């Protein structure tokens, strides 16, 4: 692995997209993907929408998984072996997916209120899951695919709770979720005082609070957290929602939690007034506490109020999910992409960095392109470091926005 | 329910820019893609841009140099900023909610004359 | 850069009689979706537009039946028939199916009394 600063192009990033079924032809538009890749195997899905992307006839969503194989050019590409289309699409939102022992869970919310966290108060929690064999048997039975709603879940204080991010981890027989709460502001215990103004000149020591909530006067708070299942026990499925602690807190949105070279990291996407990359080594599990670094370099498009590299409270409910892998913890080198423009979304950029410097970087298209959604995922295969990035992309042909798979091997060596 | 109000300067000097505040009031900007749209005094109407939820922003190509689009969620409010503004551009201005591809709501318009 | 025209400039036309204005683009007007999103607008005076057909045939929600659009190719038509009073104004053609949107010159709708 690399670990020294440069300006040469190292990273010569490959495309993978064409294993995965995405059909350029059509015009359909592909919105709320998911990627996972934990031991070889992958988890992928998408929305499929003829029209417009924000409001358009809702075709098909699909959910599948499979192997991450060497295409034989010794680049990795994503191979399905196993797929499952929901009845009504409609209904599924905000898909995360975990794996364990040759099955891989994924997790959903339904709703007849559309997005619950834009219908927030209409919505009546009802969350089920969907199992597919990464190597299916033949006519064996629920193996291959089993659908369970779920009946028991524990909130504690929370008034609903749902999945909220990409990906999860596994701990043992125990799967954890990336999730959201719903809490009413009344409940909400904050001390204003908390709230950092220090050399924020132009904003009030409330913000912080009311920016807990899409709206100043939101009915409800976002907390992002932990789903548990354990597989251990019997019986009905219970999940248990565990909250994240109140160090460096913002509103609750998408996150990942993952594993890489031993321990558990965590990345939660800033909608929020503090728009610098939030990612770290998690302390503990079941009392969630964030180790979050001090990154002073990679931020978001923030569209407005709250723009790129504002570390400053306000009240804005705006960003991307732009995510971020760990490839070395001594030095704490992380990959993953992020978009170059301070108030749109466009300009994808892949990079290596730092907790304060980019070590290396290399662009994924034009600079007209507009991208939204960024997803990255890094192993090791055949002893080489490799990492996996989706990246929404808007084609202008069709104004629709698309997923597109890229293969990067990170490089041992800078020179070349 | 449902509204879209422009607030607009109503005159500017040549050469100056242009900027309009849309207020929208009866959904979330969040669940609607927006566009700005202007009329000429004689000539049809001429489509400016398009602002996604997600904050993906295209444009009439011919603007490109000069227009911007931008959107505050919270405050429930989109902004139009335009540059160079010159004879040409005096006109009607509307914010309008897309649908599928379709404007089914316009706001009442702004209009915005150019002179000294 | 696909350009929207409108034949009849003026369309004059007595109550309970049949309007039929003409809208035909330069190329053709389908999208990779395969629908093609043709559109049919009306702004009364004094008034800001307001949709009345997409996709070619159908009518908006709280458009009344007698409003009627078809097309094929590069030719569409939009159909009053049983002309009345209140439907008088600016009928507008647009197309949304490729990324410079463009609308139609105008068709001002004027009732024979």
């Known amino acids: 692995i690399c670990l020294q600063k440069t300006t040469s192009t190292i990273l010569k990033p490959r495309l993978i997209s064409y294993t995965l079924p995405i059909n350029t032809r059509e015009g359909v538009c592909i919105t709320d993907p998911l990627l996972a890749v934990d031991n070889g195997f992958f988890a992928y899905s998408h929305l499929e929408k003829i029209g417009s992307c924000t409001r358009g006839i809702a075709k098909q969503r699909i959910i599948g998984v499979g192997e991450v194989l060497d295409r034989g050019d010794k680049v990795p590409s994503m191979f399905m072996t196993n797929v499952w289309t929901p009845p009504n699409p409609s209904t599924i939102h905000h898909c995360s997916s975990t794996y364990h022992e040759d099955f891989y869970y994924t997790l959903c919310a339904v709703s007849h209120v559309g997005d619950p966290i834009l219908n927030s108060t209409s919505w009546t929690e009802s969350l089920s899951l969907i199992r597919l064999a990464v190597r299916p048997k033949s006519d064996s039975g629920d193996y291959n695919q089993k659908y369970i709603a779920i009946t028991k879940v524990e909130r504690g204080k929370y008034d609903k709770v749902m999945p909220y991010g990409p990906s999860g981890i596994k701990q043992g027989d125990t799967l954890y979720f990336p999730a959201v709460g719903f809490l009413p502001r009344t409940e909400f215990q904050y001390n204003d005082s908390n709230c950092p103004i220090i050399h924020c000149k132009y904003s009030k020591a409330e913000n912080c609070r009311l920016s807990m909530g899409v709206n100043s006067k939101s009915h409800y708070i976002l907390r992002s957290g932990l789903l548990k299942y354990n597989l251990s026990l019997g019986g009905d499925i219970i999940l248990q929602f565990i909250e994240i602690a109140d160090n460096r807190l913002t509103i609750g949105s998408p996150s990942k939690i993952y594993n890489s070279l031993g321990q558990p990291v965590f990345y939660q996407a800033s909608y929020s007034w503090d728009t610098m990359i939030k990612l770290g080594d998690v302390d503990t599990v079941d009392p969630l506490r964030v180790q979050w670094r001090n990154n002073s370099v990679i931020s978001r498009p923030g569209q407005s109020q709250c723009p790129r590299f504002n570390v400053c409270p306000e009240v804005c409910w705006e960003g991307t999910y732009n995510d971020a892998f760990l490839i070395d913890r001594l030095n704490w080198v992380s990959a993953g992409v992020y978009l170059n423009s301070n108030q749109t979304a466009e300009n994808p950029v892949f990079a290596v960095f730092k907790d304060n410097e980019i070590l290396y970087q290399v662009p994924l298209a034009e600079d007209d392109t507009n991208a939204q959604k960024t997803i990255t995922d890094c192993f090791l295969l055949e002893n080489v470091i490799w990492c996996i990035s989706l990246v929404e992309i808007y084609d202008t042909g069709d104004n629709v926005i698309r997923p597109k798979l890229f293969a990067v091997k990170i490089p041992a060596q800078c020179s070349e | 329910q449902v509204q879209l109000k422009e607030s607009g300067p109503g005159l500017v000097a040549p050469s100056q820019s242009l900027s309009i505040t849309c207020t929208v009031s009866?959904?979330?900007?969040?669940?609607?893609?927006i566009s700005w749209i202007r009329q000429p005094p004689g000539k049809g109407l001429e489509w400016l841009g398009v602002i996604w939820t997600g904050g993906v922003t295209n444009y009439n190509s011919a603007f490109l140099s000069r227009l911007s689009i931008s959107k505050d969620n919270s405050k429930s409010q989109v902004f139009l900023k335009m540059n160079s503004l010159q004879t040409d551009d005096t006109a009607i201005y509307y914010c309008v909610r897309e649908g599928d591809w379709f404007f089914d709501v316009w706001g009442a318009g702004t209009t915005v004359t150019v002179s000294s | 850069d696909v350009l929207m025209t409108q034949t009849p400039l003026s369309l004059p036309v007595s109550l309970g009689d049949q309007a039929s204005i003409s809208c035909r683009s330069s190329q053709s007007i389908v999208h990779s979706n395969g629908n093609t999103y043709l559109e049919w607008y009306l702004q009364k005076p004094g008034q800001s537009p307001q949709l009345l057909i997409y996709?070619?045939?159908n009518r908006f929600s709280g458009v009344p039946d007698r409003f009627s659009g078809s097309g094929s190719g590069t030719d569409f038509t939009l159909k009053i028939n049983r002309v009345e009073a209140e439907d008088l104004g600016l009928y507008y053609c647009?197309?949304?199916?490729?990324?410079?949107?463009?609308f139609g010159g105008g068709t001002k709708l004027e009732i024979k009394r």
């Open positions: 009866g959904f979330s900007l969040t669940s609607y893609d």
């Open positions: 996709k070619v045939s």
């Open positions: 647009f197309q949304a199916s490729h990324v410079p949107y463009t």
